[PDB]
Amino acid sequence: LPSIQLPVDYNNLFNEITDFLVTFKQKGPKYMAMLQKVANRELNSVIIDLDDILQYQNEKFLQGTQADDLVSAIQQNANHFTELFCRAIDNNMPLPTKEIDYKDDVLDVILNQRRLRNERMLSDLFPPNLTRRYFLYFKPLSQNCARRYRKKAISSKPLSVRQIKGDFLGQLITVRGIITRVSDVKPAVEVIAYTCDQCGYEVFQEVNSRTFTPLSECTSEECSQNQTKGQLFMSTRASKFSAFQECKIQELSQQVPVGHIPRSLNIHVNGTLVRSLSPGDIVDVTGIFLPAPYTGFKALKAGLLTETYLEAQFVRQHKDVYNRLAKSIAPEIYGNLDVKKALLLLLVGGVDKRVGDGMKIRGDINVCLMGDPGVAKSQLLKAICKISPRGVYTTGALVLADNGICCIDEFDKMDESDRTAIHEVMEQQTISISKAGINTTLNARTSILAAANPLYGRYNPRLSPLDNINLPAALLSRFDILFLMLDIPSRDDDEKLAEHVTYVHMHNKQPDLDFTPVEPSKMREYIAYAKTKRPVMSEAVNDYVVQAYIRLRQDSKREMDSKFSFGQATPRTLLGIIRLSQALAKLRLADMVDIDDVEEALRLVRVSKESLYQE
Amino acid sequence: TVYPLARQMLTDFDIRNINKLSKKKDIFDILSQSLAPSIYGHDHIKKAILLMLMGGVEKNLENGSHLRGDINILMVGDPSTAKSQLLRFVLNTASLAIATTGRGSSGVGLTAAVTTDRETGERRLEAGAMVLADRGVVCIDEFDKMTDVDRVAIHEVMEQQTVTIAKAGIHTTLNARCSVIAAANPVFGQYDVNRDPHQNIALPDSLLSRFDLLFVVTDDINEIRDRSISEHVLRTHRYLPPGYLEGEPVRSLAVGEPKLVTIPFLRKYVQYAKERVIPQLTQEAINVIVKNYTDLRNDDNTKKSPITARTLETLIRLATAHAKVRLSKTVNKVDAKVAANLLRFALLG
Amino acid sequence: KVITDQDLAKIREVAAREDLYSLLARSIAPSIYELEDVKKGILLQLFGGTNKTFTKGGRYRGDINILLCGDPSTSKSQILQYVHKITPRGVYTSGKGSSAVGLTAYITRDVDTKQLVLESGALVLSDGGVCCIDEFDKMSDSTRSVLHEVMEQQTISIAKAGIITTLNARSSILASANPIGSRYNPNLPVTENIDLPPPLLS
DNA sequence: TCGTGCTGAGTGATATCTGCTTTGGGTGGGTGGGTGGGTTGAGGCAAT
DNA sequence: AGCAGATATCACTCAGCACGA
Numbered sequence A: 001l002p003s004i005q006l007p008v009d010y011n012n013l014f015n016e017i018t019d020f021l022v023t024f025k026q027k028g029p030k031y032m033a034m035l036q037k038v039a040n041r042e043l044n045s046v047i048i049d050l051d052d053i054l055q056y057q058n059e060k061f062l063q064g065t066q067a068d069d070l071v072s073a074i075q076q077n078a079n080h081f082t083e084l085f086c087r088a089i090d091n092n093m094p095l096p097t098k099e100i101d102y103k104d105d106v107l108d109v110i111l112n113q114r115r116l117r118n119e120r121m122l123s124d125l126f127p128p129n130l131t132r133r134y135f136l137y138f139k140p141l142s143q144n145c146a147r148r149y150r151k152k153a154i155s156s157k158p159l160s161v162r163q164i165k166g167d168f169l170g171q172l173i174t175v176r177g178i179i180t181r182v183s184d185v186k187p188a189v190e191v192i193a194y195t196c197d198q199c200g201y202e203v204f205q206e207v208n209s210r211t212f213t214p215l216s217e218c219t220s221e222e223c224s225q226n227q228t229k230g231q232l233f234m235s236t237r238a239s240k241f242s243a244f245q246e247c248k249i250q251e252l253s254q255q256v257p258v259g260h261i262p263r264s265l266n267i268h269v270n271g272t273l274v275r276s277l278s279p280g281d282i283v284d285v286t287g288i289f290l291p292a293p294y295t296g297f298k299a300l301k302a303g304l305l306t307e308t309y310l311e312a313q314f315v316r317q318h319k320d321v322y323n324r325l326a327k328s329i330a331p332e333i334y335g336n337l338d339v340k341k342a343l344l345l346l347l348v349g350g351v352d353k354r355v356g357d358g359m360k361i362r363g364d365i366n367v368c369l370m371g372d373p374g375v376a377k378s379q380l381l382k383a384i385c386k387i388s389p390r391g392v393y394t395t396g397a398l399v400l401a402d403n404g405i406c407c408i409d410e411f412d413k414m415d416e417s418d419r420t421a422i423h424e425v426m427e428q429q430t431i432s433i434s435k436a437g438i439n440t441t442l443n444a445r446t447s448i449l450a451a452a453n454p455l456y457g458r459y460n461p462r463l464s465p466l467d468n469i470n471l472p473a474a475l476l477s478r479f480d481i482l483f484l485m486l487d488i489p490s491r492d493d494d495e496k497l498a499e500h501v502t503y504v505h506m507h508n509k510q511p512d513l514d515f516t517p518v519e520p521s522k523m524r525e526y527i528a529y530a531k532t533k534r535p536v537m538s539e540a541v542n543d544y545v546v547q548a549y550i551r552l553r554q555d556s557k558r559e560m561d562s563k564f565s566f567g568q569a570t571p572r573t574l575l576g577i578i579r580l581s582q583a584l585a586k587l588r589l590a591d592m593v594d595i596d597d598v599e600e601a602l603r604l605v606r607v608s609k610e611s612l613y614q615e
Numbered sequence B: 001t002v003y004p005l006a007r008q009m010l011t012d013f014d015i016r017n018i019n020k021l022s023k024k025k026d027i028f029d030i031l032s033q034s035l036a037p038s039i040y041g042h043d044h045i046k047k048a049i050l051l052m053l054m055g056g057v058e059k060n061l062e063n064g065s066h067l068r069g070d071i072n073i074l075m076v077g078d079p080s081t082a083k084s085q086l087l088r089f090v091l092n093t094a095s096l097a098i099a100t101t102g103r104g105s106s107g108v109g110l111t112a113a114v115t116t117d118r119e120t121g122e123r124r125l126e127a128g129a130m131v132l133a134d135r136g137v138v139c140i141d142e143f144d145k146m147t148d149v150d151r152v153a154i155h156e157v158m159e160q161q162t163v164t165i166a167k168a169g170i171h172t173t174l175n176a177r178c179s180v181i182a183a184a185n186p187v188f189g190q191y192d193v194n195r196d197p198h199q200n201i202a203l204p205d206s207l208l209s210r211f212d213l214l215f216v217v218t219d220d221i222n223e224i225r226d227r228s229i230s231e232h233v234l235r236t237h238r239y240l241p242p243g244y245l246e247g248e249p250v251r252s253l254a255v256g257e258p259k260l261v262t263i264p265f266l267r268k269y270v271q272y273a274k275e276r277v278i279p280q281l282t283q284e285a286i287n288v289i290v291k292n293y294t295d296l297r298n299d300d301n302t303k304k305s306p307i308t309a310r311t312l313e314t315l316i317r318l319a320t321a322h323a324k325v326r327l328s329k330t331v332n333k334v335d336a337k338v339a340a341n342l343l344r345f346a347l348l349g
Numbered sequence C: 001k002v003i004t005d006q007d008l009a010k011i012r013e014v015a016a017r018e019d020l021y022s023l024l025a026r027s028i029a030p031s032i033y034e035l036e037d038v039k040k041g042i043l044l045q046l047f048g049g050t051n052k053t054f055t056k057g058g059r060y061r062g063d064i065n066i067l068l069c070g071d072p073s074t075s076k077s078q079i080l081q082y083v084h085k086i087t088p089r090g091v092y093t094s095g096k097g098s099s100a101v102g103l104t105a106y107i108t109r110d111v112d113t114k115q116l117v118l119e120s121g122a123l124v125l126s127d128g129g130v131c132c133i134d135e136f137d138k139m140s141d142s143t144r145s146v147l148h149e150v151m152e153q154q155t156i157s158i159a160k161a162g163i164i165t166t167l168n169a170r171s172s173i174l175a176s177a178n179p180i181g182s183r184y185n186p187n188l189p190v191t192e193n194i195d196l197p198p199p200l201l202s
Numbered sequence D: 001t002c003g004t005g006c007t008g009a010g011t012g013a014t015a016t017c018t019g020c021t022t023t024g025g026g027t028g029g030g031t032g033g034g035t036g037g038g039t040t041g042a043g044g045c046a047a048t
Numbered sequence E: 001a002g003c004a005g006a007t008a009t010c011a012c013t014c015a016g017c018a019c020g021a
């Protein structure tokens, strides 16, 4: 074990840490107050701000009593400084100011009795981590503070998984990425307490590894002296445990080089930081990059190759009304007012579903878009899915869409099994799993947004609407509203479309200037408010709806006498009409359903299909 | 040491030569002709290949919409029309290129395979054809001899330019930004004028719409053309390599180390243009583009491929590529006219 | 987790009521309007006939089978859901449905235990009850043959995986059907509209 | 017939040294098994 | 590193006799 002479003196650094804890001010000292709070059981986590250390160093240098660079020493090797800071805190822990029930704690009684036994023996001891009731974390050095004092902040500089090499091991670094996996919280053992059946004494063991060998034989003075062979038995009541969570962080798309596959890095979370990371959130995890040595035969067989993980220390989390909302849904596309209004109605989905007789009318205003290629079906899908809080985008996921709209693209190309799945979702609003492995049933009251293409790829006027649609007629009937979109050539419309697209391409902004789009945040919170609202309908509006229903039924029968009609009106069309009226009433923020809402719903129903079919 | 064998260093003399050659009015014609000198005719396909190599400008908007700058090309024609030879030439010339066949490829082999690391014993991903060719070109031969299962992968690739993998507890998105050039044959094996385009080609319409340009090439029997092609082929077959005697069959020193343009100079030109030029659109080009789109979309004359809003994006991409050809910071009327002419030829022949 | 003497007296009092038939018919389907005949048939199926165990003759089935076919607009699945809610024993199934357990017995592998297990189908589990099949129109050939065997012999026989066994399937069937097109054409006969074999429909 | 050694070899016993083997992965095999794990991809076959 | 088998060197019990009481 040859020795080296390194330019670090841990005694001076410990004195520096103690002075910083005792004297630093930013009232009394900040960290002294924090320790006072910890003593009274008010705080269970202490965070050391490297900015405070840098400021203290600057003040000491200004005063002329230049001291060692503590920030750099902490950054270069943080594992030792955690223990150093813990020792410094322990040596200066203030006496509690609020009386507490000491006898309640098992550890207090056990240590008091150990003291009594030791006093008796003398008349004829425990690890410091055992009694610690706090956790220590390091907050990285802020870039602003470092630039103020003319210093480089390595710890707070974001890095990708690739940029974390072997030369960064043992340092305090930050990682930017997206969490892809988080495990369940489990107890990690740090100190193990044993008992002697014969002796009556308590033994302790410190665990700092993946694995440990339990004790078997008593080591007490009494046992040794008396020659009594006493067996040691584990006691989980007096042991010390810390919450443990293992997470995976993956590279962002913009960080991967050309022609490379993303990489992932493990993260270890201990103490009160648990539950601070969830899948799908982009985070700036600051921690100590450390290796994870193997043990036993694995150690010998592995070789010099070492695994690595990150000890989490800090986590930074990254971030006329109808017409206006419709136009602001997707400004980039050419004006399609009716489709946008239908999308609003689907999104809000207002309904009163409280029949209570055994079933309840479906509470989802499902929308299906079918049209020849060229219309911006993908753009509507993506925009409406982005705005929705529970919107899920899939290509021909339902669980994530529960109690929310489902954004399904390439609906016609979907396999028959998924067709049956969505059929169950609509008719029953339930998700059922019947497998040997597991059998779970999850309710799914989720709306569906469907985009499909005709059988021949483009709509054929000669063929009937049903012929152009590959899906079963029952599925089409179950859809509350069906919108048919077509691309009819025309000089004026084509010229405006070309001008709009060209302006968007050039200036990277919306060409329209007649009106200013409403802010998306306002629109989404208004939608949430409308959803929270509950409307109500009277008997007169019920009779009006009945009259509209008989008129629509007669008209639809007459139309279906010919082959042009999509399908005959059915009580399902009724229920859809009332659902749309309830959604519009929710929009209006007025409890009573008005005749205007019913008329608007009827005109929307007419223009969804007939307006384009007649053309 | 690891010595790369991909990017040609550009000297001051090379840069000056590139600029001087670009200043010529007919630079496009010379560069297009310099591609595949052994292939007779197919001038428009060569121009399309050059524009694909140069590529357009990729713009990603703040809202999230992504507009690709890659140009995809599809050729459907009769047997013995030099489609495979053109694919081989673009494979050789392009800086990054991957060759695949219809019957030789799979969905997994295109996208990515789940495998284990010998060194570490860790489950990982292996890049596929598509992934490997990121920021490059993938040449697909016998495009119609594939399976739908396999086709789906490609469809996703072209539509989104990304690869989504959900296998063995792996959840990731792979960047696949490559230009696709493919060759195919009609269902009957020979293009039939009487039958409509839909019947001739069995590929899905959705997959077809992603290709910016569709070229239909047919073998027409004409005395003048037949004589010219036969003479060209005979002349090519008489070539002998330097330092070889007649009748001799065809079999490093250091490690660290209207005139046709030589291939290495063409590669240097392509690298320079694609690296140090980002043309921006202008008003005159926009006027030309919208005029052309309005005229083409609403016209009685039939088209081999339907007109769509994607045609406007294709026109913009071709104009940007032609602007890149001239090393011009802006897209001018000439670029729009050339793009319109190429699209019109590809559509109505 | 989250029959007595008085019950018998209440049952007898209800039976003594003159309008018991109408009362039961109304109670079966309160939310369905103007289908008295269908409700009466469903009630009679629920109560069922007498099972005869004959010496010299064999077995005569006392079950009643009802087919609910017609236009899709009318309420037909709600009736099946009500019948399930009422019948003490039964299972809900749709032909060609992956979610459902299945209509026929099959031999599977216990993933949990890696063991060979013989699992009984929906019809077997409905022994002595009413089995409601929501979508009779779309169904596998194999499944149709199994249904024919169940409605003919009232037992399901499997001779696969080295197992030769017969399972009792003495259960009634209440299936629903839809026409080939968007509606049922009165001009054509029922057999053509429902799109089912004449044997199975008879 | 109690107490105190001296003799003693027998009958232990317990404090003390000598050789596997393992993890899991083909840098132990298929005369250790496939119901102790690995295991997704390609390939050929029969019923459909 | 841990575990199971084994060797060999460590004491302790009943055995019995000489003196005297």
Ligand SMILES: Nc1ncnc2c1ncn2[C@@H]1O[C@H](COP(=O)(O)OP(=O)(O)OP(=O)(O)O)[C@@H](O)[C@H]1O
Binding pocket: A332, A333, A334, A372, A373, A374, A375, A376, A377, A378, A379, A453, A497, A500, A501, B206, B209, B309, B310
């Ligand atoms: N009204 C429009 N205004 C501007 N661009 C449009 C419009 N409609 C369609 N587009 C453009 O059409 C291009 C292709 O169409 P898109 O993917 O949006 O839908 P689609 O044709 O219905 O799709 P699919 O081909 O998958 O069936 C998109 O890039 C979009 O920019």
Ligand SMILES: Nc1ncnc2c1ncn2[C@@H]1O[C@H](COP(=O)(O)OP(=O)(O)OP(=O)(O)O)[C@@H](O)[C@H]1O
Binding pocket: B038, B039, B040, B041, B077, B078, B079, B080, B081, B082, B083, B084, B085, B086, B185, B229, B233
């Ligand atoms: N225009 C041409 N000039 C010179 N040679 C040509 C030309 N067209 C075809 N050939 C000759 O055709 C031979 C084989 O044809 P090629 O493989 O290029 O056909 P292809 O277009 O891939 O057709 P397919 O795959 O349908 O058979 C090549 O060796 C090439 O010499």
Ligand SMILES: Nc1ncnc2c1ncn2[C@@H]1O[C@H](COP(=O)(O)OP(=O)(O)OP(=O)(O)O)[C@@H](O)[C@H]1O
Binding pocket: A474, A477, A571, A572, A575, C031, C032, C033, C034, C035, C071, C072, C073, C074, C075, C076, C077, C078, C079, C178
């Ligand atoms: N007599 C009736 N009383 C009450 N509601 C009725 C009646 N007839 C039809 N309906 C309504 O008709 C709709 C039929 O829904 P149901 O789930 O029963 O359809 P279905 O028979 O399964 O349809 P499909 O054949 O299209 O799958 C329900 O809204 C039901 O309220």
Ligand SMILES: [Mg+2]
Binding pocket: A377, A378, A409
């Ligand atoms: Mg689309």
Ligand SMILES: [Mg+2]
Binding pocket: B083, B084, B141
């Ligand atoms: Mg070929």
Ligand SMILES: [Mg+2]
Binding pocket: C076, C077, C134, C176
């Ligand atoms: Mg039904």
Ligand SMILES: [Zn+2]
Binding pocket: A196, A197, A198, A199, A200, A201, A218, A219, A220, A222, A223, A230
């Ligand atoms: Zn003890």
